[PDB]
Amino acid sequence: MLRINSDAPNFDADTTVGKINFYDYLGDSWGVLFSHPADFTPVCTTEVSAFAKLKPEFDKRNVKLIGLSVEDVESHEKWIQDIKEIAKVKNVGFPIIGDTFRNVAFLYDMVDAEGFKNINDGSLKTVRSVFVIDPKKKIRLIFTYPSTVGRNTSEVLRVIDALQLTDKEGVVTPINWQPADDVIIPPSVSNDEAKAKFGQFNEIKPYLRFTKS
Numbered sequence: 001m002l003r004i005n006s007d008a009p010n011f012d013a014d015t016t017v018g019k020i021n022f023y024d025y026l027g028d029s030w031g032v033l034f035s036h037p038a039d040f041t042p043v044c045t046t047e048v049s050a051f052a053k054l055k056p057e058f059d060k061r062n063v064k065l066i067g068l069s070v071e072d073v074e075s076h077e078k079w080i081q082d083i084k085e086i087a088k089v090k091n092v093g094f095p096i097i098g099d100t101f102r103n104v105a106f107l108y109d110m111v112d113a114e115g116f117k118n119i120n121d122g123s124l125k126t127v128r129s130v131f132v133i134d135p136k137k138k139i140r141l142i143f144t145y146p147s148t149v150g151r152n153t154s155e156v157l158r159v160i161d162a163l164q165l166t167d168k169e170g171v172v173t174p175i176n177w178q179p180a181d182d183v184i185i186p187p188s189v190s191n192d193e194a195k196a197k198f199g200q201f202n203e204i205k206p207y208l209r210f211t212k213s
């Protein structure tokens, strides 16, 4: 099964922006792949609307958004029109994948079978995962909220910031970290190595050393 640190599988799909190859779409950017069981459902509609409004926040972090929903592109196009109206956005700048037969969802381990459309029978309730993918196509973080509970855009941005920072500076982030807060030196780094790389640090315990960001 796919887990954090697994490679995000590549695929070809029909989308609201035309046919794409996932890796090609992503390029060297980070990616956020978010999933929906069906179009014209309320929580998901609010969620896509929020991502659309906030796309500039993602753009500045070199992150490309992509949505998946188990319906055809034609349906997604109509849904986007509603989303534009609701969100009061001029356009939705990212694609929504038309996964009519659940093939992509299946590839991403959200369902145990592919080849059939959305029947409103409950088999699609699990098509709700969000995958944060790095420039090397590694899945870095996953979260799955049920369609009943809307996601948190701020948290998605927070984790992206933490992940990027950790990759950039070789640090780790504590619970509830916000940017500009102090970070933690990874245990793989010796105190001497830490002095060389970070300067000063506060050793709470030998394994827990805070340093400034």
Ligand code: NA
Pocket: 199, 200, 201, 202
């Ligand atoms: Na020190």
